[PDB]
């Protein structure tokens, strides 16, 4: 169970951080691209 | 073997996921300010 605890904490604790940082990166590239397009305009 | 690498990778990889996201948000949120200043000027 000692391993089971650490492994299930790997399952819950890491991917949950990946999903929001992925959506952050998506917003970060959206804002970068629209920044460059409208700035050039 | 499998216990050692998977358990140590849980801690090391999760720390590695933490440090980028916090720098990503800091840098890009300052970049939002730079965008809005230039755009309105």
């Amino acid at each position: 169970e000692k391993f089971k605890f650490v492994l299930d904490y790997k399952i819950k604790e890491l991917k949950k951080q990946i999903e929001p940082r992925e959506n952050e990166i998506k917003v970060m590239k959206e804002q970068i691209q629209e920044m460059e397009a409208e700035l050039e305009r | 073997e499998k216990f050692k690498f998977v358990l140590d990778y849980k801690i090391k990889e999760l720390k590695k996921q933490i440090e980028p996201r916090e720098n990503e948000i800091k840098v890009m949120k300052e970049q939002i300010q730079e965008m809005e200043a230039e755009l309105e000027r």
């Binding site: 409208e38 | 755009l39 309105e40």
Partner: peptide
């Protein structure tokens, strides 16, 4: 334009 939409945002802020 994006700055015009920001002017919308500003206008909503004052309305608030």
């Amino acid at each position: 334009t994006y700055t015009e939409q920001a002017s919308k945002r500003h206008h909503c802020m004052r309305l608030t």
